[PDB]
């Protein structure tokens, strides 16, 4: 295992809805937050930590978040 593979990128999303994880494993977030997908569990549930706040890392339902797809290739 070597940290540094040719071609690596994470997935950024935003909590379009609010939620209150009951257990620890589950990540607690609210409408208007960003998550960094690092270890996607399934095609429905992903794993990530609140941007800037790594201390918080738990699985969350992708159906609750929306991948922030920014558009604007043209320069300036």
UniProtKB/Swiss-Prot annotation:
Part of the intact protein present: 1067 to 1129 of 1129
Organism name: Homo sapiens (Human)
Assembly information from the UniProt record: Homodimer. Interacts with SRC and CRK. Interacts with RAB11FIP3. Interacts with PTK2B/PYK2. Interacts with CTTN. Interacts (via SH3 domain) with APC. Interacts with REPS2; the interaction is direct. Forms a complex containing RAB11A, ASAP1, RAB3IP, RAP11FIP3 and ARF4; the complex promotes preciliary trafficking; the complex binds to RHO in photoreceptor cells and promotes RHO ciliary transport.
Signal sequence coordinates: none
Post-translational modification note: Phosphorylated on tyrosine residues by SRC.
Subcellular localization: Cytoplasm; Membrane; Golgi apparatus; Golgi apparatus, trans-Golgi network
Domain notes: The PH domain most probably contributes to the phosphoinositide-dependent regulation of ADP ribosylation factors.
Domain (SH3): residue spans on this chain: 8-70
Domain of life: Eukaryota
Entry-annotated residues carrying Phosphoserine: 69
Name by which UniProt lists this protein: Arf-GAP with SH3 domain, ANK repeat and PH domain-containing protein 1
Protein function: Possesses phosphatidylinositol 4,5-bisphosphate-dependent GTPase-activating protein activity for ARF1 (ADP ribosylation factor 1) and ARF5 and a lesser activity towards ARF6. May coordinate membrane trafficking with cell growth or actin cytoskeleton remodeling by binding to both SRC and PIP2. May function as a signal transduction protein involved in the differentiation of fibroblasts into adipocytes and possibly other cell types.
